[PDB]
Short mmCIF file of C-alpha atoms in Angstrom, two decimals:
data_model
loop_
_atom_site.label_atom_id
_atom_site.label_comp_id
_atom_site.label_asym_id
_atom_site.label_seq_id
_atom_site.Cartn_x
_atom_site.Cartn_y
_atom_site.Cartn_z
CA UNK A 1 74.57 102.36 83.82
CA UNK A 2 74.63 98.57 84.14
CA UNK A 3 74.62 95.76 86.69
CA UNK A 4 74.82 91.96 86.76
CA UNK A 5 72.89 90.47 89.68
CA UNK A 6 69.92 88.29 90.57
CA UNK A 7 66.68 89.22 88.74
CA UNK A 8 64.77 90.51 91.77
CA UNK A 9 67.38 93.24 92.26
CA UNK A 10 68.04 93.57 88.52
CA UNK A 11 64.47 94.75 88.02
CA UNK A 12 64.92 96.85 91.16
CA UNK A 13 67.75 98.64 89.38
CA UNK A 14 65.55 98.90 86.28
CA UNK A 15 62.96 100.66 88.47
CA UNK A 16 64.86 103.96 88.14
CA UNK A 17 66.97 104.07 84.98
CA UNK A 18 70.26 102.21 84.80
CA UNK A 19 69.12 99.05 83.02
CA UNK A 20 69.81 95.83 84.91
CA UNK A 21 70.54 92.54 83.15
CA UNK A 22 69.69 89.70 85.50
CA UNK A 23 72.03 86.86 86.38
CA UNK A 24 69.39 84.30 85.35
CA UNK A 25 71.10 84.25 81.92
CA UNK A 26 74.74 84.17 83.08
CA UNK A 27 75.63 83.00 86.59
CA UNK A 28 79.30 82.93 85.63
CA UNK A 29 78.46 86.38 84.16
CA UNK A 30 81.44 86.30 81.77
CA UNK A 31 79.11 86.06 78.77
CA UNK A 32 76.81 88.89 79.83
CA UNK A 33 79.78 91.05 80.89
CA UNK A 34 81.45 90.50 77.51
CA UNK A 35 78.21 91.32 75.68
CA UNK A 36 77.66 94.47 77.77
CA UNK A 37 81.20 95.71 77.12
CA UNK A 38 80.75 94.74 73.45
CA UNK A 39 77.78 97.10 73.19
CA UNK A 40 80.05 99.37 75.21
CA UNK A 41 77.70 102.32 75.66
CA UNK A 42 77.91 102.12 79.46
CA UNK A 43 79.95 103.98 82.07
CA UNK A 44 80.33 101.14 84.59
CA UNK A 45 79.37 97.50 85.06
CA UNK A 46 78.93 96.60 88.73
CA UNK A 47 79.22 92.80 88.79
CA UNK A 48 77.84 90.80 91.69
CA UNK A 49 80.08 88.26 93.41
CA UNK A 50 78.27 85.16 92.19
CA UNK A 51 81.53 83.22 91.90
CA UNK A 52 84.17 85.92 91.35
CA UNK A 53 84.41 89.17 89.34
CA UNK A 54 88.09 89.67 90.29
CA UNK A 55 89.87 87.77 87.46
CA UNK A 56 89.55 90.48 84.81
CA UNK A 57 92.42 88.94 82.83
CA UNK A 58 90.26 88.32 79.75
CA UNK A 59 88.25 91.51 80.31
CA UNK A 60 91.38 93.67 80.13
CA UNK A 61 92.50 91.39 77.29
CA UNK A 62 89.50 92.47 75.23
CA UNK A 63 89.97 96.08 76.35
CA UNK A 64 93.78 96.45 76.11
CA UNK A 65 94.17 100.09 77.08
CA UNK A 66 90.62 101.43 76.95
CA UNK A 67 88.66 104.11 78.81
CA UNK A 68 85.75 101.69 79.03
CA UNK A 69 83.23 101.04 81.82
CA UNK A 70 84.99 100.50 85.14
CA UNK A 71 84.65 96.98 86.53
CA UNK A 72 83.54 97.12 90.16
CA UNK A 73 82.46 94.29 92.48
CA UNK A 74 79.25 95.45 94.13
CA UNK A 75 77.96 92.74 96.51
CA UNK A 76 76.48 89.25 96.74
CA UNK A 77 73.45 89.94 98.96
CA UNK A 78 72.43 91.72 102.18
CA UNK A 79 72.73 89.51 105.25
CA UNK A 80 75.98 90.68 106.91
CA UNK A 81 78.51 93.39 105.98
CA UNK A 82 80.71 93.50 109.08
CA UNK A 83 84.03 92.11 107.85
CA UNK A 84 83.56 92.91 104.17
CA UNK A 85 85.38 96.19 104.82
CA UNK A 86 88.63 94.57 105.93
CA UNK A 87 88.13 91.83 103.34
CA UNK A 88 88.15 94.36 100.52
CA UNK A 89 90.98 96.12 102.37
CA UNK A 90 93.30 93.10 102.45
CA UNK A 91 92.40 91.88 98.97
CA UNK A 92 92.78 95.23 97.22
CA UNK A 93 96.05 95.74 99.09
CA UNK A 94 98.04 92.54 98.72
CA UNK A 95 96.74 91.25 95.38
CA UNK A 96 97.15 94.61 93.63
CA UNK A 97 100.50 96.27 92.93
CA UNK A 98 101.87 97.15 96.37
CA UNK A 99 103.27 93.96 97.85
CA UNK A 100 102.37 92.27 101.14
CA UNK B 1 156.82 109.90 42.26
CA UNK B 2 155.26 108.37 39.15
CA UNK B 3 151.98 110.18 39.82
CA UNK B 4 153.58 113.61 40.27
CA UNK B 5 155.52 113.02 37.06
CA UNK B 6 152.55 112.03 34.91
CA UNK B 7 150.55 114.94 36.34
CA UNK B 8 152.88 117.94 36.42
CA UNK B 9 154.54 117.01 33.14
CA UNK B 10 151.90 115.54 30.81
CA UNK B 11 148.67 117.24 31.99
CA UNK B 12 146.99 114.06 33.20
CA UNK B 13 144.46 113.79 36.01
CA UNK B 14 145.58 110.97 38.30
CA UNK B 15 143.83 109.22 41.20
CA UNK B 16 146.21 107.44 43.58
CA UNK B 17 144.66 104.62 45.61
CA UNK B 18 146.93 103.80 48.55
CA UNK B 19 145.86 100.59 50.28
CA UNK B 20 146.39 99.61 53.92
CA UNK B 21 148.53 102.37 55.38
CA UNK B 22 148.53 100.28 58.57
CA UNK B 23 151.12 97.91 57.08
CA UNK B 24 153.33 100.87 56.20
CA UNK B 25 153.06 102.13 59.77
CA UNK B 26 153.93 98.62 60.98
CA UNK B 27 157.14 98.44 58.95
CA UNK B 28 157.97 101.91 60.28
CA UNK B 29 157.45 100.84 63.89
CA UNK B 30 159.56 97.73 63.33
CA UNK B 31 162.58 99.60 61.98
CA UNK B 32 162.20 102.20 64.73
CA UNK B 33 162.11 99.52 67.42
CA UNK B 34 165.15 97.73 66.04
CA UNK B 35 166.78 101.18 66.07
CA UNK B 36 165.81 101.99 69.71
CA UNK B 37 164.49 105.45 68.93
CA UNK B 38 162.32 106.73 71.79
CA UNK B 39 158.79 105.42 71.12
CA UNK B 40 156.41 108.33 70.83
CA UNK B 41 152.94 107.09 71.73
CA UNK B 42 151.89 103.47 72.22
CA UNK B 43 154.64 101.81 70.25
CA UNK B 44 155.09 103.84 67.04
CA UNK B 45 158.06 106.23 66.99
CA UNK B 46 158.08 110.01 67.27
CA UNK B 47 158.59 111.06 63.65
CA UNK B 48 155.55 109.21 62.28
CA UNK B 49 153.68 112.48 61.82
CA UNK B 50 156.62 113.70 59.74
CA UNK B 51 156.66 110.53 57.63
CA UNK B 52 152.92 110.37 56.98
CA UNK B 53 152.92 114.07 56.13
CA UNK B 54 155.86 113.57 53.78
CA UNK B 55 153.88 111.02 51.77
CA UNK B 56 150.47 112.73 52.05
CA UNK B 57 151.31 116.30 51.04
CA UNK B 58 152.33 115.19 47.53
CA UNK B 59 148.82 115.73 46.13
CA UNK B 60 147.62 119.14 45.04
CA UNK B 61 147.21 121.40 42.03
CA UNK B 62 149.59 124.05 40.69
CA UNK B 63 148.99 127.25 38.76
CA UNK B 64 149.93 127.56 35.12
CA UNK B 65 149.75 123.81 34.59
CA UNK B 66 146.48 121.90 34.43
CA UNK B 67 147.27 118.51 35.95
CA UNK B 68 145.95 117.33 39.27
CA UNK B 69 146.70 114.66 41.86
CA UNK B 70 144.03 113.38 44.26
CA UNK B 71 144.34 110.59 46.82
CA UNK B 72 142.16 108.06 48.62
CA UNK B 73 144.29 106.32 51.29
CA UNK B 74 142.44 103.26 52.54
CA UNK B 75 143.30 102.38 56.12
CA UNK B 76 141.78 100.00 58.67
CA UNK B 77 141.50 101.50 62.13
CA UNK B 78 142.76 98.53 64.16
CA UNK B 79 140.28 97.97 67.00
CA UNK B 80 137.59 100.44 65.86
CA UNK B 81 139.24 103.29 67.76
CA UNK B 82 139.36 106.79 66.30
CA UNK B 83 141.89 107.48 69.08
CA UNK B 84 144.53 105.09 67.78
CA UNK B 85 147.70 106.93 66.68
CA UNK B 86 147.41 105.86 63.03
CA UNK B 87 143.87 107.22 62.39
CA UNK B 88 144.59 110.15 64.69
CA UNK B 89 147.65 111.45 62.85
CA UNK B 90 146.09 110.65 59.47
CA UNK B 91 143.05 112.73 60.36
CA UNK B 92 145.24 115.60 61.54
CA UNK B 93 147.21 115.60 58.28
CA UNK B 94 144.63 115.05 55.54
CA UNK B 95 141.60 117.24 54.79
CA UNK B 96 138.47 115.13 55.11
CA UNK B 97 137.62 111.51 55.76
CA UNK B 98 135.00 108.84 55.09
CA UNK B 99 134.14 106.43 57.88
CA UNK B 100 132.33 103.12 57.49
CA UNK B 101 130.01 101.72 60.15
CA UNK B 102 129.92 98.15 61.42
CA UNK B 103 126.46 98.63 62.93
CA UNK B 104 125.12 99.62 59.52
CA UNK B 105 126.97 96.72 57.92
CA UNK B 106 125.05 94.37 60.22
CA UNK B 107 121.73 95.53 58.75
CA UNK B 108 122.64 94.97 55.10
CA UNK B 109 123.08 98.65 54.21
CA UNK B 110 125.46 99.45 51.36
CA UNK B 111 127.62 101.54 51.43
CA UNK B 112 127.60 101.57 55.22
CA UNK B 113 129.08 105.07 55.30
CA UNK B 114 128.35 106.60 58.68
CA UNK B 115 127.39 110.17 57.69
CA UNK B 116 127.93 111.89 61.05
CA UNK B 117 131.67 111.52 61.79
CA UNK B 118 132.86 111.81 58.15
CA UNK B 119 133.42 115.34 56.84
CA UNK B 120 135.32 117.01 54.01
CA UNK C 1 131.67 94.96 70.79
CA UNK C 2 134.42 97.36 71.87
CA UNK C 3 135.05 99.34 75.05
CA UNK C 4 135.26 103.10 74.43
CA UNK C 5 138.72 104.71 74.15
CA UNK C 6 140.76 104.17 77.27
CA UNK C 7 141.61 107.60 78.70
CA UNK C 8 139.73 110.80 79.58
CA UNK C 9 136.72 108.50 79.53
CA UNK C 10 137.64 107.52 83.09
CA UNK C 11 136.56 110.95 84.34
CA UNK C 12 133.35 110.65 82.32
CA UNK C 13 132.60 107.20 83.73
CA UNK C 14 133.07 108.44 87.28
CA UNK C 15 130.75 111.34 86.48
CA UNK C 16 128.12 108.95 85.14
CA UNK C 17 128.46 106.82 88.27
CA UNK C 18 127.85 109.85 90.47
CA UNK C 19 124.81 110.79 88.37
CA UNK C 20 123.35 107.27 88.60
CA UNK C 21 123.70 107.27 92.38
CA UNK C 22 122.02 110.68 92.59
CA UNK C 23 119.20 109.30 90.45
CA UNK C 24 118.63 106.30 92.71
CA UNK C 25 118.56 108.44 95.84
CA UNK C 26 116.10 110.83 94.18
CA UNK C 27 113.73 108.08 93.02
CA UNK C 28 113.62 106.83 96.61
CA UNK C 29 112.53 110.26 97.84
CA UNK C 30 109.79 110.32 95.19
CA UNK C 31 108.48 106.90 96.22
CA UNK C 32 108.28 108.14 99.82
CA UNK C 33 105.72 110.77 98.81
CA UNK C 34 103.86 108.25 96.66
CA UNK C 35 103.38 106.06 99.74
CA UNK C 36 102.44 109.00 101.96
CA UNK C 37 99.56 109.65 99.57
CA UNK C 38 98.60 106.01 98.98
CA UNK C 39 97.94 105.52 102.69
CA UNK C 40 95.47 108.40 102.88
CA UNK C 41 93.65 107.06 99.84
CA UNK C 42 93.40 103.56 101.31
CA UNK C 43 92.01 105.24 104.42
CA UNK C 44 89.27 107.05 102.50
CA UNK C 45 88.31 103.85 100.67
CA UNK C 46 87.06 102.35 103.94
CA UNK C 47 84.58 105.15 104.59
CA UNK C 48 83.43 104.94 100.96
CA UNK C 49 82.68 101.22 101.29
CA UNK C 50 80.96 101.88 104.62
CA UNK C 51 78.52 104.37 103.11
CA UNK C 52 77.97 102.00 100.19
CA UNK C 53 76.97 99.18 102.55
CA UNK C 54 74.68 101.57 104.43
CA UNK C 55 72.81 102.62 101.30
#
């Protein structure tokens, strides 16, 4: 029900529901993400990996125990997706709760 | 003695405040030790139940007369132990008790009377 | 503050020690099952991301 990515794919998302708000107004995307969660009427906000959507410290600061839209890194672009599997694997594993 | 007199002879209603029964028990233990008389439990001699009873049971009410004698023996449980011989025997002999609470005294309550362990 | 009265509490303290050890060795057996499920879920996540990349 939301996305934060480059405008050519933002309007692509807009093509069939699920309004897209292009990254031409927030490349850091913190401002647009905060505004979208402020309006709050969305079920998820898939944020592109412009720089990084992983540090949700301030996002969960503003939420603080909420059943709000679920942050989810989506992609950066489509040119190669061969090692992204094991990249997400390692990162979700070691940086989240379970050690190593 | 004075209380029983002024009650069962002149129809008064007395209220005897006995302070620091621990010092009385100490003098008792000292004479018993210097007498070498088979320490009962943790120092204090064997007949301490008899002695405390002898000076507690002097407070009641009779029929025909109208006087009365009621007591409030203050006593400081030494190390905050209800299992010390002095509080133990005193609780076995009297009928009721009121127990203060140091934890409640910390938080400014007054009177810090712990209401659970104190019955009548 | 003050240690509890000093007899017949020894049996109670040994009982509490036994209960604490039982608790530790039960929590371990619960964590074992938690891991045995976590690994299957981290397996399924790979296929999910694969289909996402495909689409």
